[PDB]
Every structure is written in C-alpha cells, then in structure tokens.
C-alpha cells in the first residue's frame, strides 16, 4: 500500500539533503580563515612637530 509514498518521501528528502550537503561543503571548507581585517586609523593624532617632508 505505502511503497510509492515511502519512495517519494525518501527521494525528496534525499534531494534536499544533497543540496544542503553540497552547499555546506563550500561553507565549511574555510570559515575563520576568510575572516576580517583591521584598518587602523590615526588621523595624524600623533603629530610631534615639524617634519622633513616639504608639505609643511
């Protein structure tokens, strides 16, 4: 009685699981290693006085 319904359920959930597995592989390969950076700013705040360069 229930064979076809069982088969379709198994195949459908398997397809969903396959797509999730293939995408999760890519998400899993390297995660923190594609992390962030720093980009520190000073805004010349450490100015000490005159400089060798000619702008000033």
């Amino acid at each position: 009685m229930q064979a076809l319904l069982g088969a379709r359920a198994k195949e459908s959930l398997d397809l969903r699981a396959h797509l999730k597995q293939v995408k999760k592989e890519d998400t899993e390969k390297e995660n923190r290693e594609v992390g962030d950076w720093r980009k520190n700013i000073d805004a010349l705040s450490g100015m000490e006085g005159r400089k060798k360069k000619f702008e000033s």
């Binding site: 700013i41 805004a43 010349l44 705040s45 100015m47 006085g49």
Partner: protein
C-alpha cells in the same frame, strides 16, 4: 630688545608649538568627532537595524 625679542621668539615659538598642539589636538578633536559620529551613526544604525532586526525577529 634682545631679551624681549628672544623672550618673544620663545613665547612665539612656544605659541606656534601650543597653537600647533591646539591645531593637532583640534585636528584630533575633529578626527575624534568624525569617528564618534561615524561610530555613533553606526551605533544608531546598529540600533535602527537592531530595532529592525527585532521587528523582523
């Protein structure tokens, strides 16, 4: 005259240095205000986005 001229070059140099200190300190009052507003804006936005995230939650 040399004493006033020298006292002046020194008051004046100390002034250029104090004015520079003020200029640079002010450059930083401004750079800090820019960062404060950028961060306060990111904060208000984090809070707008939080209120939104919470509303979307």
């Amino acid at each position: 005259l040399d004493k006033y001229s020298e006292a002046l070059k020194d008051a004046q140099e100390k002034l250029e240095l104090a004015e520079k200190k003020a200029t640079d300190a002010e450059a930083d009052v401004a750079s800090l205000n820019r960062r404060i507003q950028l961060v306060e804006e990111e904060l208000d936005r984090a809070q707008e986005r939080l209120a939104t995230a919470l509303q979307k939650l």
